[PDB]
Amino acid sequence: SRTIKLWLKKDVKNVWENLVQLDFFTEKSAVGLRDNATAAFYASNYQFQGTMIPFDLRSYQMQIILQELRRIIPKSNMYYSWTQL
Amino acid sequence: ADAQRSHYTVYPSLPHIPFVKLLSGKESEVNVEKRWELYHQLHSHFHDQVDHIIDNIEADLKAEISDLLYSRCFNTIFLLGSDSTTKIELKDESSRYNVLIELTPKESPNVRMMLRRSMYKLYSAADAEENDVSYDLSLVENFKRLFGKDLAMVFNFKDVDSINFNTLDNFIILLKSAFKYDHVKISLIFNINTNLSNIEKNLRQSTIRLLKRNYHKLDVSSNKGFKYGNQIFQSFLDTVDGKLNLSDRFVEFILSKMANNTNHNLQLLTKMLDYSLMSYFFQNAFSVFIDPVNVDFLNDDYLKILSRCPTFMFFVEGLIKQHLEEFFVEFLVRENPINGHAKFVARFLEEELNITNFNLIELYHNLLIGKLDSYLDRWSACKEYKDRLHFEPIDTIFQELFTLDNRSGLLTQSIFPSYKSNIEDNLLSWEQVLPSLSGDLDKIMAPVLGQLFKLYREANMTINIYDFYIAFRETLPKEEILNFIRKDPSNTKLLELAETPDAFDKVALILFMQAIFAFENMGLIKFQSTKSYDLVEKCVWRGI
Amino acid sequence: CLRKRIIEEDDQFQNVAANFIHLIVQAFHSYTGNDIFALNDLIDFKWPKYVSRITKENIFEPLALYKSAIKLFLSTDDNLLSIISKYLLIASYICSYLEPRYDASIFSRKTRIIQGRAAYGRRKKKEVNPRYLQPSLFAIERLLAIFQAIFPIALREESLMKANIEVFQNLSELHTLKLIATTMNKNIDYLSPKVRWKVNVPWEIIKEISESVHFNISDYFSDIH
Amino acid sequence: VIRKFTKKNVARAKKKYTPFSKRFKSIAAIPDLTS
Amino acid sequence: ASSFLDTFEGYFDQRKIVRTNAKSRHTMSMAPDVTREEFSLVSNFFNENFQKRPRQKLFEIQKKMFPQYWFELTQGFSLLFYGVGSKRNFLEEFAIDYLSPKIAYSQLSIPCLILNGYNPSCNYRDVFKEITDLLVPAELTRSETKYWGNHVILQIQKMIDFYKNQPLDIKLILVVHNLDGPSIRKNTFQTMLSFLSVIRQIAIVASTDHIYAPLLWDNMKAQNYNFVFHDISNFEPSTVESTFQDVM
DNA sequence: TACAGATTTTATGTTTAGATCTTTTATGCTTGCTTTTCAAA
DNA sequence: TTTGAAAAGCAAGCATAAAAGATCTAAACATAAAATCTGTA
């Protein structure tokens, strides 16, 4: 309004999955890698509630916060103004 | 006490057909035996054709699955609307072993169990045709070194909508690792019951891109093009051709109840037709008259109850406006060619106009009322052949003595009852259940469950239990209850409790509490606590 | 395919292949990121449709061939119930994404004998957009009440819909299809009053379902956000 | 016979199963265990 | 108190908000105290005396339904009985005294396995062990056991394919009192009985008490059951089923 | 007596079904305040 | 046509149910070497 393509949700889904794969987002209250084999074996026999709801409703948390995003994104980047809330 | 146990087997002592005598007990036993034999010869004639239709649809489904399956990526087949009951048989490709591996969501708690079950099945099949190994994907790596031949694995996933899609996804990328081996071919079969848009949003996009390289949709169900159904209906019509009539209300009830079931509508149709045939051969004494052998013993009761007919009354009113047993026999030789008309119209739609997507039950409905033209106007191809394809529904006297009809509400009481509503109307009314004939108490005092259900219905969503007890207590006559509890003098403790001045406050309270726990067992009420029992809330509203 | 589109119609062949790879990268690097495998899959999917538009005029100039095969570089293209069940699913979404206090304002259409005031509805429009959050939990009787409120229709005809055995059979089938979820996933007791219910499908599927039977489910969410 | 798993490191002691109560006919038939 | 009573209007109407000045905070402390013996005595007096004659008249009315029940059982339909009141005496009198010797005479008694769903101790493994003690089926091979499968369900699935090719004679009368009872309503237990109900050689007679019991069965389970529903309301006391629910 | 095979005993590993406790989050009651249609004049 | 007044809505706060899951165990399923029991011989 002040061009840049708008991508649809169908195409932003793959970007979201790559961002989950690159460890930018974590699932909410996720234990992650277990300490020993017995606890990992117990975890493998349990169906977590995040794996049964659709992916658009799964809760995620940031590994990098927006204040850290503003520090290392260059000021000549076109999305740099949106790193400040 | 065996009633206080879990399961007990008993052997009854012993010191033959379930058909009863009709005509208010005046029907002979030979007519009962004949009606039994005629019901069985129609029932077996219908179900033999049902068996041949079921075997044919299974064989055709196997043939099209094999045709899609055999015509560095998976060969993916999506069977849409599949109830996971198909037996998928594989041909014996020369110099190569074809192995079927079936996977259930109960058999798939995680990826490790999926691989271990798959590799145990593979090793068991390979040893059963042609030292042990680790049940692991390295067996796929060394399959040619251990068995000499190469391998073709066909994975059939039973009930994919109920599986954990993360586990299935990780199993698909795990199976993708077998593409680097030269001697391995992998096919996947997904039995989908909802549609493909539900399963493309639960898998990851890389998995979709992996599955896109070789995939085939196949929408195989029971509602696909109405073919299998119409064959069952035509088999039933050919069973009853020349002897029995189908009412339009019966056919529309079949259409309405078969609309409400999608996955298993075929055996529902067989069930409704079966119960209709059972009802006709249990109710009607004229069921022995569907063949001309048994027309030699028509008695006075038969002539009495065939004279109470609307068609006969219209016919004799027409004759007295214009102008008995032999005349009743005279209405048996006629054809009623509506079934032949329906099968001729179906054949003309099928192999002349190349129209397959028609419902023969709804076609028979429109032929029964007479609105065939409005049903045939939709295809826009029978504009010039509508007059030859149309024939007037003939009216035959004494048709309703040989008729599958739905007017009493029997077929919607035994097969599709209003269960919750039946419980509610039994609890609220209660004089429609118990007969109105403790001789004084039954005419003034309600049963405790029916009396409680009234105050249940007229209260609010949360009910205090003590005020509900008080409202129960005001509906009971204390003097008649104390008189009835003193009727038996042979029980000493009852008499010594009745003369105690708070006896009615004991009696009404314990009848109230046994009704409350009865309501809790039926599921009408619940408690809004675990440690307290002071407030209930109701879960059942009448009329829903 | 490339050696059949030439004959039936090596440096230049490499030029066409490299130009196609550069066009795929330029169109879809924003979509794939720096993934080699995703771009390989897109090259595999879009190569034969690009070959099928190469003529003798498009082989020597890249701009006319890019204009002729433009549709391959705007979209990714990497993709593959009864009336009672559909209205039960729609009622489940209504029960999961509306508040129970506002039900008496939307569905109540009965004439009153005993004097009583209907619910006023929500006072102010909130901006939460509740379809972006996880669904809430509801009971069976609210589901059946809203189901007969929204189901399609002299003294013995009984206009409303009864909760007979086929409605419950369809609801059990919906739970079997994992379109309705419970709090329990294993050893589920269906008859317990402490078991609650939620919809398991998003908005993009109920839109297709509601428009397959022509139900205005988007009017029901227009009073908020 | 194809085995669903293998226990290839079983080390079983040579210890018998019949107890002391079943190696004599009766209580009065038990000899002097000191000798 | 409300303008509507029934339908969804009554449901939404009776779910209002009640102010704390009309909270009705009465409790069960303000009640005449009772213990087990007098409650049992006066209760059994009202069960054996109050409205006994019209209940017996209704029972004699529904004795005439028994040939229709037998005719439904010989055609492959399973019987499910519902209604307000207990149905234990109905099923025990119909299956043992009437159905078993007349089925035995019509095929020239038939054993009756009776399951108590009100008891929480009912278990599908012991019940199927008694089933295999009665029917003595062929034992599962090694290939049919698969990999840690449920041996009960796999052996019933073997029995289904075996009993398709047998003569259609009823070898066993299975009675399930309170199919919707607490331990007995579970999905494994219902799967086992649906798979048994596929077998034509076993007659299934069952009862139910919960008003939400059709929610227990999906399309596959209802197809395997193949029920004919019968409303028998009789207002029986439910003396035996209440013994696993302390009423005090 | 006496040895070969079948069955039992004892011992351990594998997988599924389910119970119990802990922690964080949803929900329902309470009190106060403000909006809004409803039977009566 | 108004008119006050009770039904209903919104909000904060706190006690409490309930979901989610971490941890663990019993039981079903499975294998297996040594001892023990039949069974002829």
Coordinates of N, CA and C in Angstrom, one line a residue, chain A residues 65-70 79-85:
Chain A
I65 N 13.6 -14.7 19.4 CA 12.6 -13.6 19.7 C 12.8 -12.5 18.7
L66 N 11.8 -11.6 18.6 CA 11.8 -10.5 17.6 C 12.9 -9.5 17.9
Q67 N 13.2 -9.3 19.2 CA 14.3 -8.4 19.5 C 15.7 -9.0 19.0
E68 N 15.8 -10.3 19.1 CA 17.0 -10.9 18.5 C 16.9 -10.9 16.9
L69 N 15.7 -10.9 16.4 CA 15.6 -10.8 14.9 C 16.0 -9.4 14.4
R70 N 15.7 -8.3 15.2 CA 16.0 -7.0 14.8 C 17.5 -6.8 14.8
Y79 N 12.0 -6.1 5.0 CA 11.1 -6.4 6.2 C 11.7 -5.9 7.5
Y80 N 12.7 -5.0 7.5 CA 13.4 -4.6 8.7 C 12.5 -3.7 9.6
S81 N 11.6 -2.9 9.0 CA 10.7 -2.1 9.8 C 9.7 -2.9 10.6
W82 N 9.4 -4.1 10.2 CA 8.5 -4.9 10.9 C 9.1 -5.8 12.0
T83 N 10.4 -5.6 12.3 CA 11.1 -6.3 13.4 C 10.9 -5.5 14.7
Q84 N 10.2 -4.3 14.7 CA 9.9 -3.5 15.9 C 8.4 -3.5 16.0
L85 N 8.0 -3.9 17.2 CA 6.5 -3.9 17.5 C 6.0 -2.6 18.0

